[PDB]
Symmetry: D2
Subunit: 396 residues, 4 copies
């Protein structure tokens, strides 16, 4: 049929893929090649004028990476996809394709840090100005728009305390004033949230996280309309960042994404159990998780997301020293700064990533001294709860 017609789990498995026409191989072959041969001089010009269907060099396009791009276009309900070297490269290829000297961007403040440096330092050095706002208050977005504004940029849920942004409302706003809305959907995956279906124009992900899911690939993807994707490919990728994905990396992420549905169901079932345990514990002051009915935006969460996610933040009694003790006493959870792997990962920003930042500066950035972030994996939830209970008790 057409893969766009089956159920969502059937699409995760089949979309963008078929048996190799030449041999019947069921697995997508790894086309680990730099160049592609023509059968005549005429076929050579046909392709080079983009008139012919074909490949020319991998930096431009490849059969392996084309399969991954078509799969993720189906899952997010967009026209076309484009793969990239990193999550960062997906966001920069995007915004450097759209913007030029004299343009303006409105951005959420609560976004990924490497993204925050690109927007606050690199963009202004090329003539592109950025205003940062609290995107949980849609009126702040409206008040910062200018006649020069080309793009509005948001993430949801947002780190470190998992606050939300009302995608449908923000899209309407940006579009009223002739801007595009760009959403980073890395935290949720297309299994749990679909920003294009709520009005967004372009969606980006680090596949490094849940879409791959196995902790062994650095990569990104951009999904949107065909006429935007063509410019992102033939200008942004080709003539600006040079951030292409390797064919082996595309094959590993096609392999990881086959299990996306069954991994997201288990991540989210395990995280709800662990968040209820932490909510009842007398040494934990706060628990930030969208699935708990005390979250300040619980009802928006219930309309916009099909599940509440695999990430939890929480605050331990006793501040900086207590969080340092808790982290040093886990024996099953692993200390690391990534997320979305099959193993449970834990980190304590105040004593780890943000140790050089000044207390009152982190504080205005949402990061208290006792805040711990947990990426819940696929282990038995009992075992994770037991490791947490033991480390909390010691710490406190």
């Amino acid at each position: 049929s057409d893969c766009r017609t089956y159920g969502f789990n059937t699409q995760i498995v089949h979309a963008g893929q078929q048996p190799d026409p030449s041999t019947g191989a069921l697995s997508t072959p790894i086309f680990q090649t730099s160049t592609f041969v023509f059968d005549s001089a005429e076929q050579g010009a046909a392709r080079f004028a983009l008139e012919e269907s074909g490949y020319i060099f991998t930096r431009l396009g490849n059969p392996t990476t084309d399969a991954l791009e078509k799969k993720l276009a189906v899952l997010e309900r967009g026209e076309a996809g484009l793969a990239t070297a990193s999550g960062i490269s997906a966001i920069t290829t995007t915004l450097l394709t759209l913007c030029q000297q004299g343009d303006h961007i409105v951005s959420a403040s609560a976004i990924y840090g490497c993204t925050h440096a690109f927007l606050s330092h690199s963009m202004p050095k090329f003539g592109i100005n950025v205003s940062f706002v609290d995107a949980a208050k849609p009126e702040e977005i409206r008040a910062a728009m200018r006649p020069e504004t080309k793009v509005v940029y948001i993430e949801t849920p947002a780190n470190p305390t998992l606050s939300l942004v009302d995608i449908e409302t923000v899209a309407g706003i940006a579009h009223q004033q002739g801007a595009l809305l760009v959403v980073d959907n890395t935290f949720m995956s297309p299994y749990c949230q679909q920003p294009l279906q709520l009005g967004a124009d372009i969606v980006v992900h680090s596949v490094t996280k849940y879409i791959n899911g196995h902790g062994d690939v650095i990569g990104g993807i951009i999904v949107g309309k065909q006429e935007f994707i063509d410019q992102a490919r033939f200008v942004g990728l080709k003539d600006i960042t040079g951030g292409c994905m390797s064919p082996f990396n595309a094959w590993l992420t096609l392999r990881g994404v086959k299990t996306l549905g069954i991994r997201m169901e288990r991540h989210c079932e395990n995280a709800l159990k662990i968040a209820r345990f932490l909510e009842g514990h007398p040494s934990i002051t706060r628990v930030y998780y969208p699935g708990l009915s005390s979250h300040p935006q619980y009802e928006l969460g219930q309309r916009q997301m099909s599940l509440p996610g695999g990430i939890i933040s929480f605050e331990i009694a006793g501040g900086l020293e207590a969080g340092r003790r808790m982290i040093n006493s886990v024996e099953l959870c692993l200390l690391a700064v990534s997320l979305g792997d099959t193993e449970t990962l834990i980190q304590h920003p105040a004593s780890m990533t943000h140790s050089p930042v000044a207390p009152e500066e982190r504080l205005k950035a949402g990061i208290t001294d006792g805040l711990i972030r947990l990426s819940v994996g696929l282990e038995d939830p009992e075992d994770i709860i037991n490791d947490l209970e033991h480390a909390i008790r010691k710490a406190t």
Copy 2:
């Protein structure tokens, strides 16, 4: 000892590599990982302040890719290396790290086309102006410099007719006026030409070509001083292009580069034989190759390069139709647009890549109707000559 002390062939083999300290594995392991675990909260902050020796996430750095970077630093005689997703990404990470709105660049006109689009369209859209000149005349370089000029950019040899640029003379010029010189050494590899030893500040390569050598990796490398490489890594890569190399790609290129010396000796021995054959053939009007004593810059070539290279251009009698016939009649050489593989590759720009460009426009770009470009491989030179003789005879 110190790898910087052995002969050049010994360095190609050993530099940047050692047996795995943990197991004795002779091959560099493939660290195909997205993240790295800390043993305590304290080790986590140590590394994050860059105080500690270690890895954090692969986008930033990885043990596999660190080996490739250290090897190529040794071979070019530079302080440090930085690997990247493509040849394009090496050049863009470089120039976007150095330049900002209001700066100026002086560039050769005879450069790789994707590089020509980045410089003529993308840079001016960010506030960075570029002047193009004929770099074989060092006076044109001098006359275009301005008080705003940060960088001079050259390739040598240059495509499509293999003209040269006097690296030592151009370095002196740029430095007199306080600019940096950036050289693309893709065509020669560090086995045949060493731009840092002649005065250049930074060297870039597509490893896609000879450094890998096997037609199965898209990649780049930048070599320079440690204080420039640190900024290219922690700002250009991390916060601008996001163009990191995958660890599998770094491992394949470490494997390919082991044979660089013996491949470059054979490429260059085969190309001199084939260029002498073509020079004596009555249906060939011109032969462009640095090893023929009739090349207009033969003596500069003899001082700056240790061998004359594996690439040849040549013009066939009868213009456009004759070149189309010749290309369609080879049976051993393959039609393709890359170079530096183990197989011999042939292309005819006028009927292939540049068919949509207007005759008189290509002409001013050095490309006549009869020009063919040949990348000589590792086959028996007799067999390649026989395939050429047969196709020329038919065509003409």
Copy 3:
């Protein structure tokens, strides 16, 4: 702690694995090496006398493949593991290590065909005789034992009609007469059945099927006591079959097995729904599935297996021509002879694999003209049922 202490899902994730001691890499590195270097002459003899802990050459042992072997030892509750090139190599390395000229084997008749050729042709040519029996009747096993009998060999469930063998009862029998029991657990995986816990001495699997799960690796594993595994390694592998697993293949199977629990739960949930649909359909004469209470050995199944599996056989009304029509009319299920992949696979032995065998010969081998075998995947069960209903209706 000790991985042998956590819950089963925690073990699937963590057992046999840890962060790389040298770098902190979370993913097991790929040690794609043929040899290992010594630091002195003395360390060289230490290892060669097996006194020292270390590696020597990969055919013998490797850090990547050692991780997979230790994981699967934990999951089956055995002392040690040994990886191999194929499912076949696991069974042959096993039985050629145990047996010699003049020995005897008692085997089930209902086993995998390539195994049936090794036992009926290759073994007798080396002096080793084999008696085949119906292993669902434990008295037939007892009546075939001889004073020379070293090994009893069984599979359960068994193909093509999914009959069972009572592992606990057969172990007791073999042991009473001083033989070992060897069980092929390929169909169930250690998530659903644990033969060593019921009395078996040695368990073998093709990892090609569910343990890998992704249709991209050919491989096997043998699990047992350390003193048997040492002989299988240093004699059977080293001096008889030479069937070692590559380190890349071990890394892909470690990656696939991370999801084993969540894949087996979904395979088995989807297969029960599809088997109930087929049981109610008027054009299907029989349905063979252990989860249906009409299976002749339902209660044994309920004691020995934790779930009923992802495989179903069934007979369509109208014999040979009807089965050929049904197979040619599916549009989502794929025609192929493997099983345990993420995609649903279908086959019709009478018109496909066994077309050259004589009707009455196949018949005595359990294979009727209308028998179809289905390997249920991870797609939406509604979509699979709809594709079956459509193809059955046409066929019939």
Copy 4:
């Protein structure tokens, strides 16, 4: 044309390979798949009766590994090839396919040790007897043949002292009495020696050594007539050893073998220089190398081999303690037991591999206390000579 018509270097590059018909990809794709899909029930039976051209499962055959097999068939001038998991598996698949209970084998004594255990212990346990002789004296081969003799087995050159066997003379002998001759050509590669052209029936190699050449693959190949290769595939591989090669391993060895000609020329040029240096050194008692005119079989070497190889053995003054000191004092050569890598490898059997064997037993096995074996790599020969001179001087 037909690849069988070009020169030898052209064949190393091109034979068995072509651009992918479906996409034009120049590199052979990696078909990393376990199964292959049929388009109808009829195509399924066609292939299963071996009537149709196609693949079924990788254990049996694969497009990647088929390319490697066809290349090596061309290079050795045989009809067909068959790839395998290890060098050992190539030899065992071979001899277990040919022989059965009651048969006899005549073998050289001076062969690889793992091969010596298979022949002296495993074969007699299956009813197959073996007589060992000194194959440098063709009369000993003749005197051991019996009416039961099916196969004669030789290696040349032979380890540890590089003595030779006259292939043409031994073939004539075996054939006079109706046996097959099987030659292990691992030490030479098909670039330097071609046993099928001198009368041998079957040739085997470990590709682990020179054919791969890069120290990162364990593998083997068997080359012979099509009717022998078919039985080795459909019976020996399928029903006896199960020793198939993975498709990634076949792709790495296709990539390594592209440089075989240029690597063997440099290995052999470097080894002749190093063997002349050692021949003139007053602390070295003997030098075994086929290229020195004092080798006892120099003239046979000059007729049978096109170059003299990359391996050297030599004896240091002072016996066991002197060899232990020399090995512990090299700083560029690496201590290891493999050979044929791009790095120079050294070993001292008496203090390393054979430390547990009794002095007088090793002695009868050709191994004196002072014997060192050197595998010469691709480094600068000056650097290797300097490292040897320094270590010899200290030792002595």
